Amino acid sequence: HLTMPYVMPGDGEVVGVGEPVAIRFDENIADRGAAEKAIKITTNPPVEGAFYWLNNREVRWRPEHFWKPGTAVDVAVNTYGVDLGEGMFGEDNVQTHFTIGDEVIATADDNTKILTVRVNGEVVKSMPTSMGKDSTPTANGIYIVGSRYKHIIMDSSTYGVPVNSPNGYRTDVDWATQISYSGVFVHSAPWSVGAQGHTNTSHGCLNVSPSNAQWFYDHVKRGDIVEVVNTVGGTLPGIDGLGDWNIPWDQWRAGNAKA
């Protein structure tokens, strides 16, 4: 009957303009309204924001538009002793103070097949890319940058497809930056350098050259934005985990505290 919250980003971090505040709980929250009322967010400069639940254990808070660089955010999750419904009580309080770094937006355009990175509006890198093939396309939309990995074993089963099924694989890859919980990554693809900039060959990932993937890993950070445009895919789901900005503000702001 006690629930511990966990807040991200972590205290003291510098994050990109797309990073929502996230509060995760270790038990389903029966009374979302009580949880929301216990969470106090302060911004400087001040900006309006709102809560939206991605699932029964995680609530997110963000503004209507990407954060302004330099904004300082203070989060006080004052859940100690709060009745969160169905006999569960908040076990403790948590907090975080973080800041927003430079505006870094990378756009992957299927019409040009170039991933362009802008920093504070100026083009700093252009990278040829190979996105998802027609049968497994990369969805359009706004993606928040998540974790990064120097090496990972990219395994289709992690994301629902058996490795040993006709469309599964298990492959070692370098310099991977995750942009969706559904398993979309920007990563090094040495075998398809010829196709990059010309033909889509991946299972959904944004495949780029080894040096370009390493650059991305080094210069794109948690909270920065990747926008995908002009593919044959649909749109990334808003409740993906890193797809928050695909929920329009009017829907986000109305929330889902009774759902």
GROMACS .gro file of C-alpha atoms in nm:
model
  259
    1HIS     CA    1   0.000   0.000   0.000
    2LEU     CA    2   0.283   0.254  -0.044
    3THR     CA    3   0.401   0.397  -0.377
    4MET     CA    4   0.733   0.554  -0.461
    5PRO     CA    5   0.752   0.817  -0.738
    6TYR     CA    6   1.054   0.870  -0.960
    7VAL     CA    7   1.107   1.194  -1.144
    8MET     CA    8   1.304   1.265  -1.470
    9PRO     CA    9   1.496   1.436  -1.586
   10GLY     CA   10   1.746   1.388  -1.310
   11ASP     CA   11   1.849   1.663  -1.077
   12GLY     CA   12   2.099   1.896  -1.229
   13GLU     CA   13   2.070   1.775  -1.588
   14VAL     CA   14   2.071   1.992  -1.895
   15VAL     CA   15   1.818   1.867  -2.149
   16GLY     CA   16   1.680   1.956  -2.488
   17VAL     CA   17   1.379   2.161  -2.580
   18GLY     CA   18   1.149   1.863  -2.622
   19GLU     CA   19   1.199   1.705  -2.280
   20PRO     CA   20   0.887   1.661  -2.075
   21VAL     CA   21   0.885   1.634  -1.703
   22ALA     CA   22   0.806   1.270  -1.624
   23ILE     CA   23   0.684   1.124  -1.297
   24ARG     CA   24   0.674   0.746  -1.286
   25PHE     CA   25   0.519   0.548  -1.009
   26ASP     CA   26   0.588   0.196  -0.907
   27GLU     CA   27   0.213   0.107  -0.882
   28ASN     CA   28  -0.092   0.200  -1.088
   29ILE     CA   29  -0.234   0.526  -0.968
   30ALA     CA   30  -0.603   0.506  -0.901
   31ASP     CA   31  -0.658   0.873  -0.836
   32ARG     CA   32  -0.468   1.058  -1.109
   33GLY     CA   33  -0.614   1.382  -0.989
   34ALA     CA   34  -0.458   1.342  -0.650
   35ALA     CA   35  -0.121   1.276  -0.810
   36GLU     CA   36  -0.146   1.581  -1.031
   37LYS     CA   37  -0.243   1.803  -0.743
   38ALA     CA   38   0.067   1.685  -0.548
   39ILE     CA   39   0.308   1.775  -0.826
   40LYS     CA   40   0.419   2.139  -0.839
   41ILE     CA   41   0.614   2.265  -1.134
   42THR     CA   42   0.785   2.602  -1.145
   43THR     CA   43   0.946   2.747  -1.458
   44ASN     CA   44   1.166   3.051  -1.521
   45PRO     CA   45   1.089   3.209  -1.746
   46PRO     CA   46   0.737   3.106  -1.659
   47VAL     CA   47   0.544   2.912  -1.911
   48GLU     CA   48   0.208   2.735  -1.903
   49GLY     CA   49   0.210   2.358  -1.899
   50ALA     CA   50  -0.018   2.065  -1.829
   51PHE     CA   51  -0.030   1.701  -1.725
   52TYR     CA   52  -0.111   1.402  -1.951
   53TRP     CA   53  -0.082   1.035  -1.855
   54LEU     CA   54   0.093   0.801  -2.094
   55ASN     CA   55  -0.022   0.500  -1.901
   56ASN     CA   56  -0.138   0.404  -1.557
   57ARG     CA   57   0.203   0.451  -1.399
   58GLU     CA   58   0.344   0.754  -1.577
   59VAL     CA   59   0.242   1.113  -1.607
   60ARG     CA   60   0.410   1.375  -1.819
   61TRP     CA   61   0.409   1.754  -1.807
   62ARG     CA   62   0.509   1.991  -2.084
   63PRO     CA   63   0.425   2.326  -2.241
   64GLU     CA   64   0.233   2.394  -2.560
   65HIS     CA   65   0.552   2.456  -2.755
   66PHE     CA   66   0.905   2.334  -2.724
   67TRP     CA   67   1.084   2.484  -2.426
   68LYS     CA   68   1.277   2.804  -2.459
   69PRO     CA   69   1.646   2.750  -2.421
   70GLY     CA   70   1.778   2.851  -2.082
   71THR     CA   71   1.458   2.787  -1.899
   72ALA     CA   72   1.502   2.656  -1.550
   73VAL     CA   73   1.250   2.404  -1.423
   74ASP     CA   74   1.184   2.301  -1.066
   75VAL     CA   75   0.969   1.997  -0.993
   76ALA     CA   76   0.838   1.919  -0.648
   77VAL     CA   77   0.658   1.587  -0.629
   78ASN     CA   78   0.493   1.627  -0.287
   79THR     CA   79   0.346   1.285  -0.265
   80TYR     CA   80   0.443   1.190   0.089
   81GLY     CA   81   0.134   1.059   0.262
   82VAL     CA   82  -0.101   1.148  -0.020
   83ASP     CA   83  -0.393   0.912  -0.067
   84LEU     CA   84  -0.358   0.801  -0.424
   85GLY     CA   85  -0.671   0.591  -0.423
   86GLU     CA   86  -0.749   0.224  -0.361
   87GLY     CA   87  -0.570   0.238  -0.032
   88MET     CA   88  -0.229   0.335  -0.175
   89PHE     CA   89  -0.028   0.622  -0.019
   90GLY     CA   90   0.268   0.819  -0.144
   91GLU     CA   91   0.581   0.695   0.031
   92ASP     CA   92   0.790   1.002  -0.009
   93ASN     CA   93   0.855   1.329  -0.185
   94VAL     CA   94   1.090   1.372  -0.475
   95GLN     CA   95   1.238   1.659  -0.660
   96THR     CA   96   1.443   1.780  -0.950
   97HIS     CA   97   1.582   2.100  -1.085
   98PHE     CA   98   1.698   2.105  -1.434
   99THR     CA   99   1.765   2.338  -1.726
  100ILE     CA  100   1.698   2.352  -2.097
  101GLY     CA  101   2.002   2.366  -2.325
  102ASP     CA  102   2.031   2.479  -2.689
  103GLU     CA  103   1.751   2.425  -2.938
  104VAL     CA  104   1.860   2.121  -3.136
  105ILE     CA  105   1.617   1.996  -3.397
  106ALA     CA  106   1.702   1.731  -3.649
  107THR     CA  107   1.477   1.684  -3.948
  108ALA     CA  108   1.476   1.361  -4.149
  109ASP     CA  109   1.306   1.431  -4.483
  110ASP     CA  110   1.217   1.127  -4.693
  111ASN     CA  111   1.191   1.346  -5.005
  112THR     CA  112   1.556   1.447  -4.983
  113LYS     CA  113   1.678   1.152  -4.782
  114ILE     CA  114   1.892   1.392  -4.568
  115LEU     CA  115   1.885   1.427  -4.189
  116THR     CA  116   1.964   1.793  -4.118
  117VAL     CA  117   2.058   1.909  -3.770
  118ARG     CA  118   1.990   2.267  -3.676
  119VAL     CA  119   2.119   2.429  -3.363
  120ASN     CA  120   1.949   2.744  -3.264
  121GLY     CA  121   1.802   2.750  -3.610
  122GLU     CA  122   2.137   2.722  -3.810
  123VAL     CA  123   2.233   2.416  -4.006
  124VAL     CA  124   2.529   2.241  -3.853
  125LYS     CA  125   2.521   1.892  -4.009
  126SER     CA  126   2.358   1.730  -4.306
  127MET     CA  127   2.364   1.349  -4.317
  128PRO     CA  128   2.245   1.118  -4.590
  129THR     CA  129   2.004   0.866  -4.442
  130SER     CA  130   1.825   0.542  -4.521
  131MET     CA  131   1.495   0.509  -4.335
  132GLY     CA  132   1.242   0.229  -4.311
  133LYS     CA  133   1.162   0.035  -4.623
  134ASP     CA  134   0.806   0.051  -4.748
  135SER     CA  135   0.693  -0.258  -4.561
  136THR     CA  136   0.837  -0.137  -4.230
  137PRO     CA  137   0.839   0.238  -4.270
  138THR     CA  138   0.951   0.511  -4.034
  139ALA     CA  139   0.652   0.699  -3.904
  140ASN     CA  140   0.629   1.070  -3.954
  141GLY     CA  141   0.610   1.307  -3.665
  142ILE     CA  142   0.794   1.445  -3.369
  143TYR     CA  143   1.030   1.226  -3.171
  144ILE     CA  144   1.207   1.312  -2.841
  145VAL     CA  145   1.564   1.188  -2.809
  146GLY     CA  146   1.605   0.931  -2.535
  147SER     CA  147   1.901   0.717  -2.435
  148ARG     CA  148   2.220   0.659  -2.630
  149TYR     CA  149   2.435   0.351  -2.666
  150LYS     CA  150   2.790   0.314  -2.788
  151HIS     CA  151   2.720  -0.047  -2.876
  152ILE     CA  152   2.391  -0.240  -2.861
  153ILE     CA  153   2.248  -0.563  -2.983
  154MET     CA  154   1.944  -0.450  -3.174
  155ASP     CA  155   1.700  -0.739  -3.134
  156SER     CA  156   1.365  -0.745  -3.306
  157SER     CA  157   1.202  -0.943  -3.029
  158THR     CA  158   1.256  -0.669  -2.784
  159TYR     CA  159   1.007  -0.482  -2.992
  160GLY     CA  160   0.761  -0.765  -3.057
  161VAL     CA  161   0.903  -0.957  -3.355
  162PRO     CA  162   1.062  -1.296  -3.299
  163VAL     CA  163   1.415  -1.307  -3.417
  164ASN     CA  164   1.356  -1.635  -3.580
  165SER     CA  165   1.042  -1.520  -3.761
  166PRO     CA  166   1.087  -1.426  -4.125
  167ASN     CA  167   1.114  -1.056  -4.044
  168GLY     CA  168   1.325  -1.068  -3.727
  169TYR     CA  169   1.690  -1.009  -3.664
  170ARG     CA  170   1.943  -0.967  -3.392
  171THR     CA  171   2.224  -0.739  -3.492
  172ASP     CA  172   2.520  -0.564  -3.331
  173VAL     CA  173   2.522  -0.192  -3.396
  174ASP     CA  174   2.729   0.103  -3.298
  175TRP     CA  175   2.645   0.458  -3.199
  176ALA     CA  176   2.272   0.423  -3.144
  177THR     CA  177   2.053   0.705  -3.025
  178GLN     CA  178   1.696   0.596  -2.929
  179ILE     CA  179   1.416   0.816  -3.050
  180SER     CA  180   1.112   0.598  -2.975
  181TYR     CA  181   1.015   0.336  -2.722
  182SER     CA  182   0.882   0.144  -3.020
  183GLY     CA  183   1.245   0.091  -3.115
  184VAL     CA  184   1.338   0.360  -3.361
  185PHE     CA  185   1.704   0.458  -3.337
  186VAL     CA  186   1.946   0.671  -3.529
  187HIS     CA  187   2.250   0.440  -3.570
  188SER     CA  188   2.562   0.354  -3.758
  189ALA     CA  189   2.490   0.148  -4.067
  190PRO     CA  190   2.814   0.064  -4.240
  191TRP     CA  191   2.657  -0.179  -4.487
  192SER     CA  192   2.418   0.070  -4.639
  193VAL     CA  193   2.634   0.374  -4.698
  194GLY     CA  194   2.568   0.339  -5.071
  195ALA     CA  195   2.191   0.347  -5.014
  196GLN     CA  196   2.201   0.633  -4.767
  197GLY     CA  197   2.059   0.938  -4.942
  198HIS     CA  198   1.888   0.721  -5.204
  199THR     CA  199   1.699   0.417  -5.090
  200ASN     CA  200   1.516   0.322  -4.769
  201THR     CA  201   1.636  -0.013  -4.638
  202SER     CA  202   1.579  -0.028  -4.261
  203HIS     CA  203   1.319  -0.174  -4.030
  204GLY     CA  204   1.233   0.177  -3.922
  205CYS     CA  205   1.555   0.314  -3.791
  206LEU     CA  206   1.732   0.617  -3.932
  207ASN     CA  207   2.044   0.465  -4.076
  208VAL     CA  208   2.347   0.688  -4.132
  209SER     CA  209   2.721   0.656  -4.172
  210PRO     CA  210   2.945   0.550  -3.888
  211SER     CA  211   3.093   0.891  -3.847
  212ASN     CA  212   2.760   1.063  -3.874
  213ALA     CA  213   2.609   0.825  -3.618
  214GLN     CA  214   2.893   0.892  -3.379
  215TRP     CA  215   2.845   1.264  -3.431
  216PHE     CA  216   2.477   1.231  -3.352
  217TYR     CA  217   2.550   1.032  -3.038
  218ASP     CA  218   2.791   1.298  -2.929
  219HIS     CA  219   2.590   1.611  -3.015
  220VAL     CA  220   2.233   1.524  -2.985
  221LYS     CA  221   2.121   1.487  -2.624
  222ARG     CA  222   1.829   1.364  -2.423
  223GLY     CA  223   1.534   1.594  -2.495
  224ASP     CA  224   1.651   1.719  -2.831
  225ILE     CA  225   1.404   1.670  -3.117
  226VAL     CA  226   1.399   1.460  -3.435
  227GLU     CA  227   1.116   1.538  -3.678
  228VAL     CA  228   1.047   1.289  -3.956
  229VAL     CA  229   0.866   1.413  -4.263
  230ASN     CA  230   0.740   1.288  -4.596
  231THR     CA  231   0.759   0.912  -4.540
  232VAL     CA  232   0.506   0.657  -4.646
  233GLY     CA  233   0.434   0.577  -4.284
  234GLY     CA  234   0.167   0.699  -4.049
  235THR     CA  235   0.240   0.919  -3.749
  236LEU     CA  236   0.418   0.819  -3.432
  237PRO     CA  237   0.177   0.752  -3.149
  238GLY     CA  238   0.151   1.019  -2.889
  239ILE     CA  239   0.176   0.770  -2.607
  240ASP     CA  240   0.483   0.595  -2.738
  241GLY     CA  241   0.698   0.717  -2.455
  242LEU     CA  242   0.893   0.962  -2.667
  243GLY     CA  243   0.605   1.071  -2.886
  244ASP     CA  244   0.441   1.325  -2.654
  245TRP     CA  245   0.447   1.611  -2.900
  246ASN     CA  246   0.222   1.429  -3.145
  247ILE     CA  247  -0.066   1.484  -2.906
  248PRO     CA  248  -0.199   1.827  -3.001
  249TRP     CA  249  -0.192   2.083  -2.724
  250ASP     CA  250  -0.563   2.118  -2.693
  251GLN     CA  251  -0.594   1.747  -2.625
  252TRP     CA  252  -0.286   1.742  -2.404
  253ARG     CA  253  -0.404   2.032  -2.195
  254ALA     CA  254  -0.748   1.883  -2.140
  255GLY     CA  255  -0.568   1.583  -1.992
  256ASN     CA  256  -0.688   1.240  -1.898
  257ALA     CA  257  -0.704   1.248  -1.521
  258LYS     CA  258  -1.034   1.058  -1.519
  259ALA     CA  259  -0.926   0.784  -1.772
   0.00000   0.00000   0.00000
